[PDB]
Design a protein around this ligand. Structure first.
Ligand SMILES: *[C@@H]1O[C@H](CO)[C@@H](O[C@@H]2O[C@H](CO)[C@@H](O[C@@H]3O[C@H](CO[C@H]4O[C@H](CO[C@H]5O[C@H](CO)[C@@H](O)[C@H](O)[C@@H]5O)[C@@H](O)[C@H](O[C@H]5O[C@H](CO)[C@@H](O)[C@H](O)[C@@H]5O)[C@@H]4O)[C@@H](O)[C@H](O[C@H]4O[C@H](CO)[C@@H](O)[C@H](O)[C@@H]4O[C@H]4O[C@H](CO)[C@@H](O)[C@H](O)[C@@H]4O)[C@@H]3O)[C@H](O)[C@H]2NC(C)=O)[C@H](O)[C@H]1NC(C)=O
Ligand SMILES: CCCCCCCCCCCCCC(=O)O[C@H](COC(=O)CCCCCCCCCC)COP(=O)(O)OCC[N+](C)(C)C
Ligand SMILES: CCCCCCCCCCCCCC(=O)O[C@H](COC(=O)CCCCCCCCCC)COP(=O)(O)OCC[N+](C)(C)C
Ligand SMILES: CCCCCCCCCCCCCC(=O)O[C@H](COC(=O)CCCCCCCCCC)COP(=O)(O)OCC[N+](C)(C)C
Ligand SMILES: CCCCCCCCCCCCCC(=O)O[C@H](COC(=O)CCCCCCCCCC)COP(=O)(O)OCC[N+](C)(C)C
Ligand SMILES: C[C@H]1CC[C@]2(OC1)O[C@H]1[C@H](O)[C@@H]3[C@H]4CC[C@@H]5C[C@H](O[C@H]6O[C@@H](CO)[C@H](O)[C@@H](O)[C@@H]6O)[C@@H](O)C[C@@]5(C)[C@@H]4CC[C@@]3(C)[C@@H]1[C@H]2C
Ligand SMILES: C[C@H]1CC[C@]2(OC1)O[C@H]1[C@H](O)[C@@H]3[C@H]4CC[C@@H]5C[C@H](O[C@H]6O[C@@H](CO)[C@H](O)[C@@H](O)[C@@H]6O)[C@@H](O)C[C@@]5(C)[C@@H]4CC[C@@]3(C)[C@@H]1[C@H]2C
Ligand SMILES: C[C@H]1CC[C@]2(OC1)O[C@H]1[C@H](O)[C@@H]3[C@H]4CC[C@@H]5C[C@H](O[C@H]6O[C@@H](CO)[C@H](O)[C@@H](O)[C@@H]6O)[C@@H](O)C[C@@]5(C)[C@@H]4CC[C@@]3(C)[C@@H]1[C@H]2C
Ligand SMILES: C[C@H]1CC[C@]2(OC1)O[C@H]1[C@H](O)[C@@H]3[C@H]4CC[C@@H]5C[C@H](O[C@H]6O[C@@H](CO)[C@H](O)[C@@H](O)[C@@H]6O)[C@@H](O)C[C@@]5(C)[C@@H]4CC[C@@]3(C)[C@@H]1[C@H]2C
Ligand SMILES: C[C@H]1CC[C@]2(OC1)O[C@H]1[C@H](O)[C@@H]3[C@H]4CC[C@@H]5C[C@H](O[C@H]6O[C@@H](CO)[C@H](O)[C@@H](O)[C@@H]6O)[C@@H](O)C[C@@]5(C)[C@@H]4CC[C@@]3(C)[C@@H]1[C@H]2C
Ligand SMILES: *[C@@H]1O[C@H](CO)[C@@H](O[C@@H]2O[C@H](CO)[C@@H](O)[C@H](O)[C@H]2NC(C)=O)[C@H](O)[C@H]1NC(C)=O
Ligand SMILES: *[C@@H]1O[C@H](CO)[C@@H](O[C@@H]2O[C@H](CO)[C@@H](O)[C@H](O)[C@H]2NC(C)=O)[C@H](O)[C@H]1NC(C)=O
Ligand SMILES: [Mg+2]
Lengths: 37, 428, 7, 92, 78, 264
């Protein structure tokens, strides 16, 4: 009836994986503000 | 293949609102001939309680459960033994059955300041196709208040349990009527109808919800209901139910308990280190014939219930989850709401569920309907809590069909402006 | 300020 | 933020109830709606003794919002209709 | 079998749904504000249609993804 | 800053769920309206008729989904006059009025256990006035006042109100409800005055439901009398001595007595 102990979240690791997507967003934004010329 | 049972001890438990009978039966094979086949042994049910069966199980020596197939003889259940027995060997088998809606309340109209009495009609003898050599029946009642009990062998009565005689020799398919009338101040709660929706989302959260309609079956109340007697006079309405606790699965994060009319603020949730137990207290106390309808929901993360490999996913959940102790469900409908691009779908279930054709479900920002699986079941019990799995396949790229619609929408919202400053519409 | 009787 | 997203005063319940009827029966059923569950021995002609401006607006926003597959219940529309219109009042 | 499969992870870590919304929503707003300004200070002859369509596309792209992540942070799970 | 303060503290308050604040800042929610209306929604017949004052006419039909007699929107004032006369007479006239309208339940909001201002006793005088407006010969406002000229609930109240149906309906079995805090047995937290009629009994009604803080009380209108009875004890003269017999019966000796029975 009772399930058991919960599972630790295997999602990510700090100082690399959390900021990687945000940095991808920034790195796309800057060349977009280059197509002026 | 012709065999008899040497010693059978059956115990009937009536302290619940449903009757649980357990028979330890020792199958012995009469040593006649060298036919060592003895593979499957029949199991029978009395005709009066045929429609009232819930879950039948066979356990041997405490080991793994055996498998029983429903069988018709020109109902019966055939049981396949693990190791066939040679003539002259004994196997100890345990047959445990649960009967629902079998205790009828006899007064049937009970005031607020009274007790509740229930009557039960069962069998003295182990109703089996094979002759029994010794059989002892033991009834475990609820309280020490017995009104009339059938005396086949002038049985003794200890604390609350009454023990019957030895019943030396009987033929096969033998029936006798045993009636017991006692006092049962126990929660008679029946879940009339449950609809249980599961929604799968690959963004990382699966939401489960359940609408439960439940009524207090036994001993409908007659006369006035005065809360002053309910509140400042002890032991008034002992047959009433005031609260019941549901054991919610571990890592249930957003637990909402509500009604058809708004929120309900009378629930206490405690997070244990194995589950999450939330005690639900309804808006009003139930007294007999009184019903309530509530909705309990929670969404839990998918990194423990969904397993994937390449392109093939598989979800493993429970078919029916714990609602209260010794629950009984009359009608049940499970719906699984898979995401939009589920190409193939297979469902593996551990018992016979009656599934209906698939119907689409249209939700936020979806162009094509997402597959829904509907499975109906009748007369569940507290022991049908098992796991079903569903296999499906789902392309990864189709997920970014969800971020595109919004983008397109915004583009349209801009394109209007681009076509708006290109219009003159002036006459002069 | 509602549609009730003034108490 | 506090309590719950439900209706409050005595009057908005009738507005809500007739709006629910307009959601589940269409317009020409709400125009001819003869409520027999109010003023019991007499019955109340709702379509001809009410102002159908709040109900029609709520039902129209509900229909537009459910045609785009944004499944919102009509009690949420009836709750959050007023602030949205406060914005338009500021513009006016 | 259920033994040879791995437990399913979300493609984006949930604890970074908020930080990835604002960044994908601020930029979008910025681009939209650049479009609107451009449409107020431009005469009919001077306006170039290609810059209009391009800034519309980029602003709509970032605004749409930001709206999705906002929608998914509050608890809708599209 | 003033606008934010006024919206925060004054106008953002629901009347469906009441909030009583604990001393430590914890807030408890008195949720008795929705409790009673949900009972009424799921424990009655589908075609039951409830009688209430006009204020809640909407709220019953929205929440509880039951047939009301008088609604919140007022377009027929003599119907409300009938309801007011039923709510402000004794049980016999009120029972006739309730029989001719095929009512089943009667709903009264009583805010005396907790300190709730607007209950039906605070809105009773408007019932009396509205019923006087259409039936001047039956209901007199001055009749519900004390000979001094004030409206009170004590022993000094008028016996024309202490047998009213609203009074017998919202104070039933309240003369025994004493709070743990040391105060009189019967006490009204709004009308800070001890009730004069501690014991009241019904003849054509019976209590059907009563919310947790006794905020909403629902009574059931019983069926008509099964059979008529004599109004007086049967005829007893003084010519022969009565010589009434004594019970002579226990829970063990259940044996009656017969005058003309042959002895052994
Ligand atoms: C919309 O609907 C939702 C859902 O209905 C509403 O949400 C609900 O809101 C309530 C409160 O309003 C939440 O309740 C909380 O429940 C917890 C859990 O309580 C259980 O555990 C308690 C502790 O148990 C251990 O310890 C005891 C020994 O004391 C052991 O015996 C146990 O075995 C455990 O080891 C336990 O005390 C509780 O029992 C109580 O209830 C039973 C009922 O049968 C009684 O008999 C008992 O005597 C006892 O009263 C229960 O088993 C509670 O811990 C919470 O209490 C907090 O709040 C109290 C005030 O109400 C306060 O006195 C407590 O100290 C406690 O305070 C907490 O919070 C403080 C900050 O505010 C902290 O500083 C403090 O340290 C502490 O952490 C509370 O009762 C529901 O969880 C919640 N429902 C859901 C699903 O989340 C919502 O309100 C609605 N919104 C609306 C209407 O707007
Ligand atoms: C129920 C539907 C009714 C159908 C309407 C049938 C119309 C019949 C013929 C209409 C003739 C149209 C005349 C017309 O378009 O001229 C309009 C000004 O013209 C008007 O003011 C009348 C406009 C009426 C049409 C509005 C609804 C039409 C819906 C289709 C878009 C502009 O005149 P101007 O005075 O030049 O305004 C220019 C001012 N600016 C600063 C913006 C430059
Ligand atoms: C085409 C025409 C378009 C016109 C737009 C029409 C607007 C209708 C949209 C209705 C949105 C309803 C959303 C909603 O129901 O949210 C509610 C309430 O909780 C909230 O705080 C939500 C407030 C923020 C909602 C803002 C979204 C509206 C944006 C459109 C202007 C959730 O609250 P609940 O969870 O139900 O209440 C529990 C409260 N506790 C604190 C006790 C837990
Ligand atoms: C942008 C404007 C979009 C135009 C929408 C007009 C039609 C929408 C509409 O029908 O509104 C009504 C319910 O609400 C109404 O009755 C709408 C009436 C108000 C329409 C105002 C006319 C628009 C301005 C004129 C140019 C919807 O109810 P029905 O369409 O009658 O049926 C829906 C219920 N079923 C279960 C049967 C499906
Ligand atoms: C295309 C035309 C213009 C579009 C206008 C946008 C209209 C907004 C649509 C509202 C969507 C309904 C939200 C909703 O379903 O409620 C919550 C979850 O919702 C919430 O708790 C609040 C989230 C609201 C944020 C919406 C922001 C989207 C803005 C995009 C422009 C989920 O419900 P549940 O979690 O199932 O629990 C039910 C609680 N209720 C009381 C609400 C019934
Ligand atoms: C304009 C915005 C749009 C949204 C986004 O930013 C830029 O553009 C997404 C990319 O598609 C990224 C994925 C690429 C595939 C890659 C597979 C790996 O295997 C895995 O490790 C990471 C993964 C999934 C990338 C994660 C971050 C994503 C989703 C990025 C978002 C933050
Ligand atoms: C940004 C936009 C890009 C275009 C689009 O929206 C988002 O993205 C498409 C998807 O690929 C959808 C198809 C997937 C396969 C699915 C197979 C079923 O079988 C069939 O019934 C429907 C079908 C073909 C889907 C139809 C809608 C499509 C084409 C969607 C468009 C509206
Ligand atoms: C930015 C806007 C662009 C236009 C649109 O919205 C977003 O994007 C379209 C999608 O392509 C949808 C179709 C996909 C295939 C799907 C096939 C099924 O078969 C059929 O039942 C439904 C159907 C045709 C979808 C209908 C709605 C469509 C056309 C959507 C429009 C409203
Ligand atoms: C929510 C509603 C708000 C009101 C409105 O619909 C949506 O939105 C208004 C626009 O702002 C229009 C004005 C723009 C400036 C323009 C200045 C000229 O000088 C003058 O002649 C015309 C004028 C005032 C426009 C008239 C129509 C307006 C008021 C529109 C209404 C229909
Ligand atoms: C969140 C808010 C922040 C403030 C603002 O809105 C969104 O975000 C600004 C941008 O930076 C815009 C500039 C983009 C580059 C463009 C270069 C041209 O060369 C020049 O002519 C115009 C210029 C500078 C844009 C003007 C409008 C700005 C300043 C926008 C504001 C209104
Ligand atoms: C309020 O109660 C009435 C009566 O119980 C409900 O009306 C019934 O609705 C169901 C489904 O819509 C029908 O099958 C019945 O035939 C209806 N009964 C009558 C007498 O018309 C009504 O739906 C309820 N309102 C709700 C639930 O919002
Ligand atoms: C209940 O009240 C009614 C009137 O409100 C009383 O009826 C009148 O009682 C007097 C008493 O003699 C009669 O003379 C009248 O004929 C009655 N009818 C009317 C219309 O006035 C009734 O007696 C009261 N019952 C009680 C107090 O027990
Ligand atoms: Mg998806």
């Amino acid at each position: 009836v009772q399930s058991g102990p919960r599972t630790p979240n295997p999602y990510a690791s700090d100082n690399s994986s959390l900021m990687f997507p945000i940095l991808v967003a920034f790195g796309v934004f800057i060349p977009t503000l280059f197509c002026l010329c | 293949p012709p065999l008899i049972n040497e010693d059978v001890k059956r115990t009937v438990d009536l302290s619940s609102h449903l009757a649980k009978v357990t028979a330890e039966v020792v199958l012995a094979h009469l040593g006649g001939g060298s036919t060592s086949r003895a593979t499957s042994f029949l199991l029978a049910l009395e005709p009066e309680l045929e429609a009232r069966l819930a879950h039948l199980g066979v356990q041997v020596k405490g080991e793994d459960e055996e498998e029983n197939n429903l069988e018709v003889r020109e109902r019966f259940f055939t049981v396949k033994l693990p190791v066939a027995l040679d003539p002259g060997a004994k196997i100890s088998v345990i047959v445990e059955t649960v009967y629902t809606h079998v205790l009828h309340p006899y007064p049937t109209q009970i005031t607020q300041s009274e007790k509740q009495f229930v009557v039960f009609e069962g069998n003295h003898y182990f109703y089996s196709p094979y002759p029994t050599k010794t059989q002892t029946m033991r009834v475990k009642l609820a309280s020490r208040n017995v009104e009339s009990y059938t005396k086949l062998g002038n049985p003794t009565r200890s604390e609350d349990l009454l023990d019957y005689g030895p019943f030396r020799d009987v033929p096969a398919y033998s029936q006798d009527t045993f009636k017991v009338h006692y006092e049962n101040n126990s929660p008679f709660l029946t879940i009339t109808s449950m609809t249980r929706v599961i929604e799968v989302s690959h963004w990382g959260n699966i939401a489960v919800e359940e609408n439960v309609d439940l009524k207090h079956t036994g001993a409908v109340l007659k006369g006035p209901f005065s809360r002053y007697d309910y509140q400042r006079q002890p032991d008034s309405g002992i047959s009433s139910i005031r609260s019941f606790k549901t054991i919610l699965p571990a890592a249930a994060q957003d637990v909402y308990y509500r009604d058809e009319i708004g929120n309900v603020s009378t629930s206490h949730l405690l997070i244990l280190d194995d589950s999450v137990e939330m005690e639900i207290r309804p808006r009003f106390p139930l007294f007999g014939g009184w019903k309530t309808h509530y909705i309990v929901g929670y969404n839990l993360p998918s990194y423990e219930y969904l397993y994937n490999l390449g392109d093939q996913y598989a979800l493993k959940m429970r078919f029916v989850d714990h609602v209260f102790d010794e629950q009984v469900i009359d009608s049940l409908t499970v719906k699984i709401i898979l995401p939009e691009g589920a190409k193939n779908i297979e469902i593996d279930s551990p018992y016979e569920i009656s599934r209906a054709p698939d119907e689409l479900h249209y939700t936020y920002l979806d162009t094509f309907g997402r597959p829904v699986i509907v499975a109906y079941k009748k007369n569940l019990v507290e022991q049908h809590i098992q796991d079903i799995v569903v296999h499906y396949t789902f392309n990864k790229v189709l997920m970014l069909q969800e971020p595109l619609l919004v983008v397109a929408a915004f583009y349209i919202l801009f394109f209007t402006v681009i076509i708006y400053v290109r219009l003159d519409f002036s006459i002069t | 300020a509602a549609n009730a009787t003034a108490a | 933020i506090r309590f719950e997203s439900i209706i409050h005063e005595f009057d908005p319940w009738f507005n809500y109830r007739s709006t629910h009827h307009l959601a589940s029966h269409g317009f020409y059923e709400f125009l001819n709606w003869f409520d027999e569950r109010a003023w019991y021995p007499l019955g109340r002609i709702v379509g001809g003794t009410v102002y159908p401006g709040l109900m029609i607006t709520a039902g129209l926003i509900h229909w537009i919002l459910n045609t785009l597959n944004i499944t919102v219940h009509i009690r949420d529309v009836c709750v959050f209709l007023a602030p949205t219109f406060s914005g338009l009042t500021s513009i006016s | 079998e259920l033994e040879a499969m791995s437990r399913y992870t979300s493609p984006v870590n949930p604890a970074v749904f908020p930080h990835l919304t604002v960044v994908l929503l601020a930029i979008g707003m910025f681009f939209t504000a650049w479009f609107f300004v451009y449409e107020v200070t431009s005469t009919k002859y001077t306006r170039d249609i290609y810059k209009e369509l391009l800034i519309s596309l980029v602003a709509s792209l970032f605004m749409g993804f930001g709206v999705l992540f906002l929608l998914l942070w509050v608890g809708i799970y599209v | 800053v003033h606008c934010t303060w006024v919206t925060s503290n004054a106008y953002s308050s629901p009347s469906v769920v009441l909030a009583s604040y604990n001393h430590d800042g914890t807030r408890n929610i008195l949720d008795d309206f929705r409790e009673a209306y949900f009972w009424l929604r799921q424990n009655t017949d589908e075609h039951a008729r409830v009688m209430s004052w006009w204020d809640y006419g909407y709220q019953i039909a929205g929440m509880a989904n039951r047939t009301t007699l008088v609604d919140n929107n007022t377009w027929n004032n003599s119907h409300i006059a009938l309801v007011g006369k039923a709510m402000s007479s004794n049980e016999t006239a009120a029972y006739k009025i309730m029989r001719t309208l095929d009512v089943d339940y009667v709903l009264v909001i009583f805010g005396g256990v907790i300190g709730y201002s607007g209950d039906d006793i605070n809105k009773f005088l408007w019932m009396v006035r509205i019923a006087e407006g259409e039936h001047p010969k039956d209901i007199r406002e001055s009749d519900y006042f004390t000979p001094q000229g004030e409206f009170r609930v004590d022993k000094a109240g008028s016996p024309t109100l202490l047998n009213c149906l609203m009074y017998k309906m919202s104070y039933y079995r309240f003369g025994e409800m004493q709070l743990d805090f040391r105060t009189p047995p019967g006490f009204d937290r709004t009308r800070n005055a001890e009730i004069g009629n501690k014991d009241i009994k019904f003849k054509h009604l019976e209590e059907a439901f009563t919310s947790e803080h006794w905020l909403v009380r629902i009574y059931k209108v019983k069926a008509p009398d099964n059979r008529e009875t004599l109004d007086h004890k049967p005829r007893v003269t003084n010519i022969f001595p009565k010589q009434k017999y004594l019970s002579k019966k226990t829970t063990k000796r259940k044996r009656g007595y017969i005058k003309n029975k042959l002895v052994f």
